[PDB]
Amino acid sequence: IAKVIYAMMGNKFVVDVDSNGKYVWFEFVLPGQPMNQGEIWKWRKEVNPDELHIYISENFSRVMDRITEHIKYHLSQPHESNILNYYKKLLKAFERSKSKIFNDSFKKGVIRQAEFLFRQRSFIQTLDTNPHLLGVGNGVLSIETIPAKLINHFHEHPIHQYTHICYVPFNPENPWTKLLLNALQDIIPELDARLWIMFYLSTAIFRGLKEALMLLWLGGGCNGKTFLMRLVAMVLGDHYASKLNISLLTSCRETAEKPNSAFMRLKGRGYGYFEETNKSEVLNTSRLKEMVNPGDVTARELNQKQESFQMTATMVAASNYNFIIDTTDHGTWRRLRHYRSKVKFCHNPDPSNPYEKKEDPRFIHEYIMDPDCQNAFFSILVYFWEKLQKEYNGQIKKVFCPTIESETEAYRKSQDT
Amino acid sequence: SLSILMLHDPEARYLHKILNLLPPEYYVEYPLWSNVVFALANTSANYRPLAEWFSQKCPEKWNTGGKEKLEKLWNDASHHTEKKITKRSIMYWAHKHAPQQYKEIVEQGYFSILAEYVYSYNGMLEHYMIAKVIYAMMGNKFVVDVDSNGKYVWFEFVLPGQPMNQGEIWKWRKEVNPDELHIYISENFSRVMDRITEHIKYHLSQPHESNILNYYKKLLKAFERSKSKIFNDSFKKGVIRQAEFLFRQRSFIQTLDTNPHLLGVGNGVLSIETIPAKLINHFHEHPIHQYTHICYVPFNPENPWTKLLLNALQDIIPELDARLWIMFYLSTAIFRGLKEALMLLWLGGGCNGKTFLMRLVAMVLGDHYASKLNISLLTSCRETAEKPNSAFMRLKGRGYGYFEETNKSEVLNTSRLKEMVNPGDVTARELNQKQESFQMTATMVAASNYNFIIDTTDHGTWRRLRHYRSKVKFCHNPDPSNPYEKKEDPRFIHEYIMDPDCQNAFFSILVYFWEKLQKEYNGQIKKVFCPTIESETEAYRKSQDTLHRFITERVTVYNLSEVVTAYAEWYNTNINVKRHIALELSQELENSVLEKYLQWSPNKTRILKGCRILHKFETLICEPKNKWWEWSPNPS
DNA sequence: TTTTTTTTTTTTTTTTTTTTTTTTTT
DNA sequence: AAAA
Ligand SMILES: Nc1ncnc2c1ncn2[C@@H]1O[C@H](COP(=O)(O)OP(=O)(O)NP(=O)(O)O)[C@@H](O)[C@H]1O
């Protein structure tokens, strides 16, 4: 029955041996079937194939009915005696075996046998390898060519992870788009700094090897930080972006030990951020350098064998005070960027000061959970990435910003006692 | 063209039959008719003719109205990935309006299913041919989903009149292994087998040919052996394992308890979606699992416990504005969504309200929604790298946490402060689990006897803080002429907390106050006015801010290096004999009151003037009638 | 400072059955 | 006695 089943649906299930050595089942979802939210046209991991069990017991049964009626038909026609005896014996034996497909143990055995037929070697390690494909709420998004194209039909791209944010083409006339643009312009007035900081955040959707560069900007308080940073993470989803822990920077070098789960984040991610400090901390000038170099790094999860992975994710960190850096080598201090906020939100925005605006205690407690604003923000990000790619050929350093590489080099003129 | 769908889909006919059962009296009015239309629209998108068939009844409303508004509602429900109402409500309504006459339909139906199987397979019953029948019988009381670990889990909807714990009616409960399903298979399902047996006997009695009688005899003999396998343990386990697939409802665990406007109470489920709060104590469909064991009653001041609690609470803190503010802040604990990044921190001499009100709220909200935490989450540094921390894995979904212990005066940290009060996110690990990031939303308070040590001046640490101190004292010797002293009652603690009735009264008080705040200040806790607070707090801010004390106590140009040395020695002389490596002093120096004395020396040093370095001694509201809880007037 | 111990694998996975099953029925 |  395993051969027959593989004939029936060999195009909707794939089996491969995971890291731990136990077989796992993947299946391709199609519209109009019971399913989670926003994972259409994508492979979903399945601990135990229940759809296969119900298919075996229901749809495969119809074929057995065809066999039974064929047996009855050939029994109807007149023939010899011995042939009729043979057909009667065959029919009775088959009837005894007709109900075995409903038994639980038999189905488990059938599934275990089918695990060998369905196997497709080299499927896990080829999954989500292409950095030009993004899993979105209403399909999979392609950024191979400009303009970006949305795939919402059949394909063969092995896409597993996704974000639950539906994608629409960038329309500035949408009320959410205009509101986000206005609030964003209010966050930072300078045009050049705004364009540069948006270009830096646009590359987060990419997942291949990027330019070695770090972003680090502090604020006095009640500033736009932790609003747009958390907004980007919410848009990207935990699959592609997640928060980190400052202990990966402020603490000492991670001792040999054995496992490391906190560092096991940012493996396959494209974006991470820190927004907690106290007084000021040192960054060790190391244990971050390999977190920004476009190379690989090695660590291991809980009760799992040692492994190494590439370092491909845009980084950013916020605080309230300045950071402590003690070095002058050209190798470091070259892949760092610093910004300082110039605005402040409060309930009493005293006039005559442009660096002061009325606070709206609604951008945080809501306006993040609303899906439509997230869709608009995703449109903004994809538009900006397209612009950067078609203008500067994907080089964040080639863009020019007078405010940056002036304040940052002024910081370089400090910290050099 | 409902007839074709009737032909194609039996369930369609069955559902239409259910419509046939219940009276159209509730179909007449728009609300319930729209409800049933939405419900059937949730089940696929091709059942439109069935409701359309249901629409011609009373066609006066249907045409010119109902007809077009039906398709309007269908289109609306088409694009509303929102709260779902399904056929279960229709079945419950049919059971309500027309009991004891609808059931015969359902027994006929699954008797037909079982008979179809037994005829198709000559009485050889296996697994999954009883799973279908069981799912047909009880498909509205069990749901199966897969949790993170990969294990299948069973949930069941409880109903009144069945064995259960205290106060978990109308809510789902997790079960490791479904008992009720096993007893149901063994006992209730057996009755259908009797129907099959008697049907076989009946058709055996009727006169027929020889061959057909032989066939019926063989069928009966075969079925008899299979009739007794439903009592076998291994067979029941196989049936359960097979039925696990049919019962599965994808995206159930991840949508469980997600709505922050629903609370599980001892006598049902409470909804604070609208004002006033509505108590649901009947059938519903919201996925509520966790609960508190406190029954809810509408807020009534006439209850003796309510009056006693109000009087005692007023006795705890005299000031009207402070009382209203601190009650408004505590009322937000019932909410579980994003809140204002605010924290309360109040201390007293002893035998006061500290470590008392927090406990009462703690018991009222139950361990599911509120819990006590450990102060080491504040007065200690972060754990090294990725050492698992199960203490932090409290407050995951909790709405309230409190602190009650300190050792003299110690630091508070700010990293943890800016981590556990923000409406942002947080990540951590507990033990033998992978890293996890969970949204955190909980009002927090801390009780102590001594002040906390704060070393910072920015908004990022001072915006989120509030401070209060007690003004009474409970003891057995109530010295007269001192209103800040009351005869203690050693009975509010050793009892009056374990009593359920006072807990119910306090919960009523809390929900009433939350409703008041929501309808008055639109949910903005910062918008409310309190003169005692935001003055005592800023007075605390006028302490713990040694820079201004140094400026007013000890303050040519002398450059800049003298300032940090002067600050350090002043610290040693007045605060602590230790340095503070305050190289940064320059920026908050100019942020302090030093701009007028600020100088810019030609030797590329921006410095200070007027450096008269003093070394030793060389020098140069209303009150209510009887109801304070009545919210007072609009200014209040 | 103590860095390692605590956590970790685990750890049950063969029994369940299956088959037979003689007896019964042919 | 072989089959169910
Ligand atoms: N309004 C009240 N009227 C009378 N007695 C009260 C009142 N409130 C509390 N009490 C009593 O006063 C005591 C309260 O103790 P408690 O509040 O725990 O002290 P505390 O504030 O925590 N200081 P400490 O316990 O030393 O940390 C109990 O005996 C209560 O019964």
Ligand SMILES: Nc1ncnc2c1ncn2[C@@H]1O[C@H](COP(=O)(O)OP(=O)(O)NP(=O)(O)O)[C@@H](O)[C@H]1O
């Ligand atoms: N145009 C605007 N854009 C963004 N935020 C705004 C705007 N106008 C007002 N705000 C306020 O900015 C807040 C978001 O900033 P918020 O994260 O609260 O500051 P913060 O810097 O993170 N606090 P902290 O981390 O301690 O410095 C919102 O809650 C609003 O009250």
Ligand SMILES: [Mg+2]
């Ligand atoms: Mg902010």
Ligand SMILES: [Mg+2]
């Ligand atoms: Mg107390």
